[PDB]
Amino acid sequence: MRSSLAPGVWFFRAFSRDSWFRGLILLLTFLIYACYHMSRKPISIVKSRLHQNCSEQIKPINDTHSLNDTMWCSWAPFDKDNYKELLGGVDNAFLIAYAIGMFISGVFGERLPLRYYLSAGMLLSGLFTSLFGLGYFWNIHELWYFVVIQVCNGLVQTTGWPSVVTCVGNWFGKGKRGFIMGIWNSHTSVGNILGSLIAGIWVNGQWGLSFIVPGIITAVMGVITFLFLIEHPEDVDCAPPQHHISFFGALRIPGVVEFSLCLLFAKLVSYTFLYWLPLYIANVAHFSAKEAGDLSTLFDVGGIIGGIVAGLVSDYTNGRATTCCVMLILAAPMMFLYNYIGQDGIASSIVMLIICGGLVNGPYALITTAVSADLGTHKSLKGNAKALSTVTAIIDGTGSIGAALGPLLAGLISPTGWNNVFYMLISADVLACLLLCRLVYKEILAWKVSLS
Amino acid sequence: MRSSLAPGVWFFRAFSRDSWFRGLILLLTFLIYACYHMSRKPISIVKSRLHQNCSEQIKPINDTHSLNDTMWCSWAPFDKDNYKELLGGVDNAFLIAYAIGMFISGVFGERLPLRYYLSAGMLLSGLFTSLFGLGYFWNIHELWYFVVIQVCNGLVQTTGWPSVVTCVGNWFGKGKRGFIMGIWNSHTSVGNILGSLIAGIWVNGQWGLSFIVPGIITAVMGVITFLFLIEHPEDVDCAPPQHHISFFGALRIPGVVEFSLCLLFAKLVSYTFLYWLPLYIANVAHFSAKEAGDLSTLFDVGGIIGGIVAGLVSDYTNGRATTCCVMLILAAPMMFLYNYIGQDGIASSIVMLIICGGLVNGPYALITTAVSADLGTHKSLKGNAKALSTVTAIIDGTGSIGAALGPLLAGLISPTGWNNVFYMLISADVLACLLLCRLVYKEILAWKVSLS
Ligand SMILES: O=P(O)(O)OC[C@H]1O[C@H](O)[C@H](O)[C@@H](O)[C@@H]1O
Numbered sequence: 001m002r003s004s005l006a007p008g009v010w011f012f013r014a015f016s017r018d019s020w021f022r023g024l025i026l027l028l029t030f031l032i033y034a035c036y037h038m039s040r041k042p043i044s045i046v047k048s049r050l051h052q053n054c055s056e057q058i059k060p061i062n063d064t065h066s067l068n069d070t071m072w073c074s075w076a077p078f079d080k081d082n083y084k085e086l087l088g089g090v091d092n093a094f095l096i097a098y099a100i101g102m103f104i105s106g107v108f109g110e111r112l113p114l115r116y117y118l119s120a121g122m123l124l125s126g127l128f129t130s131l132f133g134l135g136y137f138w139n140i141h142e143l144w145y146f147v148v149i150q151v152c153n154g155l156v157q158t159t160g161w162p163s164v165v166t167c168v169g170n171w172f173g174k175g176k177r178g179f180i181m182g183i184w185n186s187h188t189s190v191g192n193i194l195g196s197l198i199a200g201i202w203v204n205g206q207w208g209l210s211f212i213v214p215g216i217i218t219a220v221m222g223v224i225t226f227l228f229l230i231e232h233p234e235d236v237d238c239a240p241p242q243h244h245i246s247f248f249g250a251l252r253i254p255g256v257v258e259f260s261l262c263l264l265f266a267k268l269v270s271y272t273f274l275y276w277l278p279l280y281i282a283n284v285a286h287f288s289a290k291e292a293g294d295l296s297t298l299f300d301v302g303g304i305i306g307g308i309v310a311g312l313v314s315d316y317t318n319g320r321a322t323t324c325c326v327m328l329i330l331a332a333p334m335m336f337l338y339n340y341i342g343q344d345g346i347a348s349s350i351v352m353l354i355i356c357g358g359l360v361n362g363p364y365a366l367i368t369t370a371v372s373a374d375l376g377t378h379k380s381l382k383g384n385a386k387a388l389s390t391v392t393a394i395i396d397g398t399g400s401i402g403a404a405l406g407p408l409l410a411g412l413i414s415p416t417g418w419n420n421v422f423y424m425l426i427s428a429d430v431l432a433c434l435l436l437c438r439l440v441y442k443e444i445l446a447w448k449v450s451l452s
Numbered sequence: 453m454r455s456s457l458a459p460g461v462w463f464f465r466a467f468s469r470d471s472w473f474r475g476l477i478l479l480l481t482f483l484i485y486a487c488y489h490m491s492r493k494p495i496s497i498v499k500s501r502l503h504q505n506c507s508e509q510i511k512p513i514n515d516t517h518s519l520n521d522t523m524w525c526s527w528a529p530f531d532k533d534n535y536k537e538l539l540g541g542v543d544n545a546f547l548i549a550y551a552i553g554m555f556i557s558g559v560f561g562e563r564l565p566l567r568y569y570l571s572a573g574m575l576l577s578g579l580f581t582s583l584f585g586l587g588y589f590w591n592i593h594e595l596w597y598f599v600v601i602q603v604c605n606g607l608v609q610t611t612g613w614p615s616v617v618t619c620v621g622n623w624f625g626k627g628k629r630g631f632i633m634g635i636w637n638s639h640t641s642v643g644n645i646l647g648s649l650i651a652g653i654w655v656n657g658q659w660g661l662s663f664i665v666p667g668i669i670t671a672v673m674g675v676i677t678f679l680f681l682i683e684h685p686e687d688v689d690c691a692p693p694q695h696h697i698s699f700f701g702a703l704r705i706p707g708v709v710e711f712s713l714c715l716l717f718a719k720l721v722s723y724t725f726l727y728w729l730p731l732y733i734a735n736v737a738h739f740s741a742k743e744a745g746d747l748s749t750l751f752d753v754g755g756i757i758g759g760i761v762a763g764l765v766s767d768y769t770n771g772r773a774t775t776c777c778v779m780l781i782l783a784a785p786m787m788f789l790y791n792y793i794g795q796d797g798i799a800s801s802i803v804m805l806i807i808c809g810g811l812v813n814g815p816y817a818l819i820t821t822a823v824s825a826d827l828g829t830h831k832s833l834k835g836n837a838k839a840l841s842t843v844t845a846i847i848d849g850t851g852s853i854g855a856a857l858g859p860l861l862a863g864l865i866s867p868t869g870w871n872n873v874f875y876m877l878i879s880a881d882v883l884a885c886l887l888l889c890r891l892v893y894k895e896i897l898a899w900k901v902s903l904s
């Protein structure tokens with residue numbers, strides 16, 4: 001009768017029954033959509049391996065050249081002078097089929113059960129990623145094989161996000177916001193920050209195992225999701241969350257017509273860093289393809305902090321739009337200085353990657369809730385759920401056209417120098433920071449009430 | 453309303469509230485007493501490193517010899533011809549202080565709370581194990597340092613077992629027996645089978661990190677036990693388990709006087725294999741000290757199977773004594789054949805280690821319950837709890853004198869050849885299989901009732 005309860009189980013018994021079921025559904029859907037971004041990454045890390053320089057390459061013992069070849073280093077379709085323009089098509093042959101997939105998944109998406117539709121997405125997303133890596137063993141040398149695998153990997157892998165938002169919205173109720181779901185939104189950057197560390201291993205050597213291993217980890221987390229997913233909280237009998245064509249008319253609203261071209265510009269800037277940075281940092285600093293991949297991750301370790309800090313500060317100050325304009329208008333001088341003096345001493349680049357990763361990938365997770373907060377208050381009121389569904393089908397529609405216009409435009413300027421790429425990416429942030437004609441003009445208008 | 457419950461959570465919701473609390477207390481006390489046996493092991497794996505042969509050793513670049521030395525391979529007290537007799541004292545300077553510690557812990561043991569007495573045992577058991585390994589960095593060359601560390605590591609590490617049996621006996625109630633606690637009794641062999649794989653790493657080279665790392669893993673599982681230990685099931689309000697000097701007179705009973713000298717012989721045989729086998733297998737097969745340590749584990753992977761099979765078969769057949777005499781009387785020809793033709797072709801030794809590990813370490817976990825079942829039925833009946841406590845203080849008393857007589861006797865015969873060691877270990881099994889004058893004569897007596 002002398003020994004009391006231990007501190008561990010006395011801590012663990014404080015939490016209610018509901019607060020464990022709304023607590024493991026964050027740990028499930030964290031590791032689901034992190035494993036999606038781990039799958040999408042290694043096409044962007046192996047680009048400095050499919051074409052390379054035979055001058056620094058040692059001569060082979062096995063005679064596979066004809067003494068004037070210099071094409072036995074390169075993989076075979078990516079061999080000529082256009083190794084940057086024939087690869088910028090393979091980069092968005094995934095993204096165009098992804099942008100069509102997000103639009104079709106707004107029709108045939110709710111008509112299937114969620115656990116049978118998310119787990120058959122993570123299995124056919126781990127199949128088609130690895131058929132891209134089995135091209136190394138079957139030594140297929142054709143451009144028309146590596147594209148159809150991408151156009152079918154883009155159309156399958158769109159089952160990830162519109163299932164995760166419903167699985168969390170059934171437990172928490174359409175737009176929670178706090179410190180916990182500020183941590184949960186780093187699930188799309190943890191995926192990139194360990195999709196480069198895992199895939200990087202096999203690069204120098206047999207690169208076919210850079211696509212097979214993240215094509216099997218996604219296939220196993222497609223089984224774990226099939227065994228342990230709970231859609232609606234009435235299943236385990238927990239508590240429900242506590243509650244709170246017309247297209248031509250939709251262009252007449254003073255809303256969408258200036259935010260559709262603000263999600264187009266924002267994602268340009270983020271996705272060209274997602275894809276073409278492990279080739280830039282290998283081409284300028286003259287590293288290998290393991291030192292190019294592992295150095296990039298310091299962009300994402302700033303992308304985490306830029307999502308935490310801008311989420312807290314926009315909760316201390318009411319209105320989540322005036323803290324996006326500051327970071328967008330401040331990102332441009334930092335990436336100009338990073339192109340200016342950021343590739344000689346590593347103490348400069350380890351600072352500059354983290355700063356231009358905080359300032360670019362920060363507001364990316366914030367401007368969507370910022371604009372959806374404004375479009376809730378209109379003459380077309382909150383009761384018209386179909387009207388808000390259609391006018392938020394448009395914004396996230398052109399948001400994914402800004403995806404496909406990123407690396408396609410980056411893979412045609414890049415043979416004319418890298419500096420012209422950063423002029424475009426600096427001009428795009430200032431063209432994207434023109435949301436202030438509406439949201440900032442309303443938010444500073446409502447701060448004079450602090451005088452009263 | 454179409455998606456049902458998943459198979460995973462529908463499986464997990466079948467088990468009652470009590471069956472998780474009596475289910476994690478096996479997973480805690482498995483990893484506690486496995487981490488004790490991981491700590492005790494690496495003195496037995498590094499013995500082929502503290503003294504070695506300079507003939508196969510390459511000559512050093514740094515001049516640390518005087519051209520006739522041949523003692524710069526050896527560690528400094530273990531250098532002369534008696535490197536097997538000065539090490540057999542360090543082997544049981546742990547075990548004598550352990551045998552005194554088990555007897556003192558029958559007096560001052562219940563007078564402390566269990567969670568404060570098991571967690572200060574796994575911390576002062578990870579301190580004094582690692583002070584033996586800090587002798588490599590402080591390069592102390594003295595026999596009188598490595599013994600006092602052992603005589604204080606033996607006296608502390610006796611807090612392990614008489615706390616684990618009370619922590620399980622409060623939940624399950626003095627002697628459960630089934631397939632689950634047949635698996636739980638392999639916790640003393642999983643510790644040896646991963647105390648050789650972990651410690652083996654640093655042997656060839658800096659052997660001081662063969663004692664520091666299992667001196668820190670025990671120190672961390674001394675914290676995990678401090679946070680998550682539950683003694684009595686009235687603490688979390690589960691269900692209680694369902695229930696069922698006099699020393700000179702204790703020698704007059706027809707019991708103890710022939711089982712005290714049966715636990716003395718049984719543990720001799722097991723402990724000389726626990727300690728002196730990674731030196732035998734390095735000395736005969738002429739391996740290194742990583743191939744000697746990793747080959748030994750195939751003894752313990754037979755020690756697991758010999759504990760599972762003899763636990764099931766003694767439940768299919770009533771009476772747990774006639775299945776111990778078979779394995780003890782059959783172990784002797786197999787270890788004779790293992791000394792005869794078991795060190796030339798590895799396909800022979802990989803069979804023979806597993807067979808003489810099943811037949812030797814099998815009944816070790818079974819004869820104690822076999823004798824405690826018989827001593828429950830006597831004229832001194834089950835009500836006299838102090839009488840059974842005293843007459844089971846004697847059997848487990850001399851059980852630990854059989855510990856200290858093992859490696860001490862093995863470290864004085866071993867400079868006269870290894871074959872004379874196996875003659876002693878073959879004679880000890882036949883001298884230990886003379887329990888049949890009492891238990892087998894009673895058990896075959898009660899099988900004629902199967903005729904009626
Ligand atoms: O993860 P993606 O495919 O880039 O989708 C982008 C969506 O997820 C991000 O992580 C943000 O949480 C959302 O603001 C954004 O709409």
Ligand SMILES: O=P(O)(O)OC[C@H]1O[C@H](O)[C@H](O)[C@@H](O)[C@@H]1O
Pocket residue numbers: 613637640816817818820821
């Ligand atoms: O684990 P040891 O210190 O060798 O203690 C020996 C005790 O534990 C073994 O694993 C068996 O379960 C018991 O029959 C034995 O009495």
